[PDB]
Design a protein around this ligand. Structure first.
Ligand SMILES: *[C@@H]1O[C@H](CO[C@@H]2O[C@@H](C)[C@@H](O)[C@@H](O)[C@@H]2O)[C@@H](O[C@@H]2O[C@H](CO)[C@@H](O)[C@H](O)[C@H]2NC(C)=O)[C@H](O)[C@H]1NC(C)=O
Ligand SMILES: *[C@@H]1O[C@H](CO)[C@@H](O[C@@H]2O[C@H](CO)[C@@H](O)[C@H](O)[C@H]2NC(C)=O)[C@H](O)[C@H]1NC(C)=O
Ligand SMILES: *[C@@H]1O[C@H](CO)[C@@H](O)[C@H](O)[C@H]1NC(C)=O
Ligand SMILES: *[C@@H]1O[C@H](CO)[C@@H](O)[C@H](O)[C@H]1NC(C)=O
Ligand SMILES: *[C@@H]1O[C@H](CO)[C@@H](O)[C@H](O)[C@H]1NC(C)=O
Ligand SMILES: *[C@@H]1O[C@H](CO)[C@@H](O)[C@H](O)[C@H]1NC(C)=O
Ligand SMILES: *[C@@H]1O[C@H](CO)[C@@H](O)[C@H](O)[C@H]1NC(C)=O
Ligand SMILES: [Zn+2]
Lengths: 596, 195
């Protein structure tokens, strides 16, 4: 009886217990997300406590099987998932201090209160309030007031907590046989053991710079176009050869440029495609929306949705009698239970969100036969990519013409093409530099290359040199600007968005090539293509059973992340921008600042 | 006429667990298979060996019926020459098995909100199981090189596990009652057959 038959039996017992415990927890959470009452909150608390206690106990018993004596590459992954120590490597005092710091920072972010200096009897929160201010205002001084206040009253209280957070997380990482917390985060993409499909944790960095170097020219042209069109709204606040101010990007932190479409629209006269009225006038309801999505998924070879999906899923807001959390979520309770929670309305946005969440459900259904610890995406950037691609396929004018939402005599021009392409680029291409900047800054801080007294200096130098944005007012070492974002105050990773954004267009190009599509890649509908569906399903069923290198190769025929498919998607927009920028300057200078 | 009562096991109140499966013998009666066609929705109705149409005009010696209930994705293992946890450690069918197996959904009766843990099967066993053999043993299974003396944990596990059926499960995790019919022909004169 070697270690193999000892690990196998332990994994069998864990597999048969975790399913029941997680099902109970998921059912309690679903009941709370439908009904809001103290009893349901208590039920969630009890179920979660049982699940966490069982998980720790099994993780403690999982350390008696050394990894070097096990050779299957299937049971090794389950034990690797189970054997992660985490906070147990620290003392009780340090662990409780870390939890206290995390809860304090989360509470400060959640209840962040800023008030104007004229009347404390009426003042705003983050949501709503400041978000509406910096999403729907054209005033320069009010946006600056909100931007500086949120980082003044809130940013002050997080830096002393953030420093101790960094120190304690680094202690935990070094106790877990790592180098730092950034190495711990990069450990998600680590692959060892399989010959020819290896991936070191330091390779992720080099791949990120290599992809960004090819991303840069398109971002520079988009930056030039946005800067040229923002000088008409703020005539005396932007330099033609400089960097965009950080408080005029349509968002609190500049993560997305979505709210600048009204100011940067290429052809204002021609509107975008909106089938909300064509849905209102033809007796379209939520049930028909989800039936249409199911028909689309069946047309490519993927199976139906279960009989329990249509009965146990709440697809409409209950009303004032009940209280439910309206947030589109795809639920995998396990044991053959799949549900979608959505307060669906008759709208094109909900029409695409239905496809997103049903692609999530299909991806979950694909790997239902895998063991419990291997039922998830290949990495952290694969599960949303499928939802995004199967949402992109449903927004094409050809698909909407096929289902009768658009008139048959509708002829599409090359102006709506550019409008849609720029709308996509404002939210897809405009977020990659921000993610790169934030993750690179956090990695340097965790390593120790940035001393404690140069955090803001390095932060703003990186912002000017990579993103191309400049602070409106100077910040000293008393502020913690990165902590103002949700994903920094709450301990969360951030590179998954970059990886998903690059993966989704690779998947789309592969499937469109498999569908014999002729023309631009942005006009792609994968409907009525059984060959395309099988190619995607060959990857969807793997789970974590195989390295994400092989999973990616199954679909795109390549072992590494690539950016050329992304560039091919925006080629017409790139040519249009190059033609429109022939009389402007492309690039920015770090020296210029608004307060200079 | 004393008809063979093929309606008392098909319509019982509570069935037995997979590992502890009961046996009901049928003899000294005339068999009418028309009443077997009741309960029209059948999940799986396959016969190995004899044919259902010609089963009426055939006289045998004894007929054995065994009753158990399993989950949806395990009915495939009530076929001969099949390997699985149920097919190896709970119930075995010979390579030359003759008869039919009948399975149908039983979600409404055998499922309870909050879980139904009263039906249990076996997951660990030192050796495999010979055909038509039962095992109600409950000794502690040893997965290591150290004696256990009878205790849970450390490297010891309880062999039998509880299904925990719930009405909201999927089609493969929902209960499915299963009955197996076996036929034997001994040197004794055949009596068990209908008109
Ligand atoms: C997907 O295909 C269906 C069915 O069309 C049939 O199969 C195709 C592969 C092709 O061989 C067609 O010639 C076949 O008729 C399409 O549904 C039909 O669409 C046409 C549009 O001209 C319509 O007149 C029919 O009434 C539809 N039949 C139905 C709804 O039963 C569907 O439009 C295709 N989806 C696309 C192209 O996105
Ligand atoms: C997780 O932590 C446990 C203990 O907190 C580690 O178990 C010890 O590992 C050391 C390593 O040399 C052994 O010398 C000890 O005998 C182990 N047991 C105890 C009780 O200390 C475990 O190794 C940690 N996990 C990892 C992956 O390092
Ligand atoms: C859940 O909400 C429904 C809607 O009125 C109500 O009838 C039911 O009692 C609620 N459940 C609990 C446990 O309160
Ligand atoms: C790994 O373990 C599984 C568990 O059954 C087994 O099927 C598989 O054959 C093992 N891998 C190899 C290479 O034998
Ligand atoms: C999916 O459901 C539709 C309608 O219920 C049916 O026509 C179709 O055959 C189903 N597909 C499969 C693979 O069963
Ligand atoms: C669209 O096509 C017309 C056709 O002549 C062409 O003149 C024009 O340059 C194209 N592009 C735009 C943005 O209109
Ligand atoms: C099974 O028993 C119930 C309860 O008496 C009865 O109503 C039903 O008709 C029986 N089924 C058959 C096939 O006789
Ligand atoms: Zn999603």
């Amino acid at each position: 009886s070697t270690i193999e038959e000892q690990a196998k039996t332990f994994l069998d017992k864990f597999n048969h217990e975790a399913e029941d415990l997680f099902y109970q927890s998921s059912l309690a959470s679903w009941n709370y997300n439908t009904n809001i009452t103290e009893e349901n909150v208590q039920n969630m608390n009890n179920a979660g406590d049982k699940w966490s206690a069982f998980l720790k106990e099994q993780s403690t018993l999982a350390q008696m099987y050394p990894l070097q004596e096990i050779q299957n590459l299937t049971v090794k992954l389950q034990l690797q998932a189970l054997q992660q120590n985490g906070s147990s490597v620290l003392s009780e005092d340090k662990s409780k201090r870390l939890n206290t710091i995390l809860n304090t920072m989360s509470t400060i972010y959640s209840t962040g209160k800023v008030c104007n200096p004229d009347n404390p009897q009426e003042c705003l929160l983050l949501e709503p309030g400041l978000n509406e201010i910096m999403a729907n205002s054209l005033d320069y001084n009010e946006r600056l007031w909100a931007w500086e206040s949120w980082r003044s009253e809130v940013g002050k209280q997080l830096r002393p907590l953030y420093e101790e957070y960094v120190v304690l997380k680094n202690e935990m990482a070094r106790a877990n046989h790592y180098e730092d917390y950034g190495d711990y985060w990069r450990g998600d993409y680590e692959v060892n053991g399989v010959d020819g499909y290896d991936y070191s944790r330091g390779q992720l960095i080099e791949d990120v710079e290599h992809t960004f170097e090819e991303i840069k020219p398109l971002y520079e042209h988009l930056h030039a176009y946005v800067r040229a069109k923002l000088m008409n709204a703020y005539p005396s606040y932007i330099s033609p050869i400089g960097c965009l101010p950080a408080h005029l990007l349509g968002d609190m932190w500049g993560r997305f440029w979505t709210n600048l479409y009204s100011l940067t629209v290429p052809f204002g006269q021609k509107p975008n495609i909106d089938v909300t009225d064509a849905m209102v006038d033809q007796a379209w309801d939520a049930q028909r929306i989800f039936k249409e999505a199911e028909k689309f998924f069946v047309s490519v070879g993927l199976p139906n949705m279960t009989q329990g999906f249509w009965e146990n899923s709440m697809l409409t807001d209950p009303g004032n009698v009940q209280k439910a959390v309206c947030h589109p979520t795809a639920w995998d309770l396990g044991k053959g239970d799949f549900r979608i929670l959505m307060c669906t309305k008759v709208t094109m946005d909900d029409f695409l969100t239905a496809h997103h969440e049903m692609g999530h459900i299909q991806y979950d259904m694909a790997y239902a036969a895998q063991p419990f610890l291997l039922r998830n995406g290949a990495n952290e950037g694969f599960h949303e990519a499928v939802g995004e691609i199967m949402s992109l396929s449903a927004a094409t004018p050809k698909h909407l013409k096929s289902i009768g939402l658009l008139s048959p005599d509708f002829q599409e021009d090359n102006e709506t093409e550019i409008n849609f392409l720029l709308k996509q680029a404002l939210t897809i291409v405009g977020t990659l530099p921000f993610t790169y900047m934030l993750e690179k800054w956090r990695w340097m801080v965790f390593k120790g290359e940035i001393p404690k007294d140069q955090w803001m200096k390095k932060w703003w130098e990186m912002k000017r040199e990579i993103v191309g944005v400049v602070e409106p007012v100077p910040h000293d070492e008393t502020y913690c600007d990165p902590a103002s974002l949700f994903h920094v105050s709450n301990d969360y990773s951030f590179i998954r968005y970059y990886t998903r954004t690059l993966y989704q267009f690779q998947f789309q190009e592969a499937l469109c090539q498999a569908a014999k599509h002729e023309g631009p890649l942005h006009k792609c509908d994968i409907s009525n293509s059984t060959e395309a569906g099988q190619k995607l399903f060959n990857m969807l069923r793997l789970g974590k059973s195989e390295p994400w290198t092989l999973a990616l190769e199954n679909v795109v025929g390549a072992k590494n992340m690539n950016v050329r498919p992304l560039l091919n998607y925006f080629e017409p927009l790139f040519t249009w921008l190059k033609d429109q920028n022939k009389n402007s300057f492309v690039g920015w200078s770090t020296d210029w600042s608004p307060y200079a | 006429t004393n008809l063979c009562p093929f309606d008392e096991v098909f319509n019982a109140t509570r069935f037995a667990s997979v590992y502890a499966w009961n046996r009901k013998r049928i003899s000294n009666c005339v068999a009418d298979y028309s009443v077997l066609y009741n309960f029209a929705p059948f999940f799986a109705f396959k016969c190995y060996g004899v044919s259902p149409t010609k089963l009426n005009d055939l006289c045998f010696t004894n007929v054995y019926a065994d009753s158990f209930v399993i989950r949806g994705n395990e009915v495939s293992q009530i076929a001969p020459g099949q390997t699985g946890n149920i097919a190896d450690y709970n119930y075995k069918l010979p390579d030359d098995f003759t008869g039919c197996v009948i399975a149908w959904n039983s979600n409404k009766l055998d499922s309870t909100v909050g879980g139904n843990y009263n039906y249990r099967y076996r997951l660990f066993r030192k050796s495999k199981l010979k055909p038509f053999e039962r095992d109600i043993s409950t000794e502690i299974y040893q997965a290591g090189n150290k004696p256990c003396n009878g205790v849970a944990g450390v490297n010891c596990y309880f062999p039998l596990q509880s299904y925990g059926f719930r009405p909201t499960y999927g089609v493969g995790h929902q209960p499915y009652r299963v009955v197996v019919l076996s036929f034997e022909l001994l040197h004794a004169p055949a009596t068990v057959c209908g008109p």
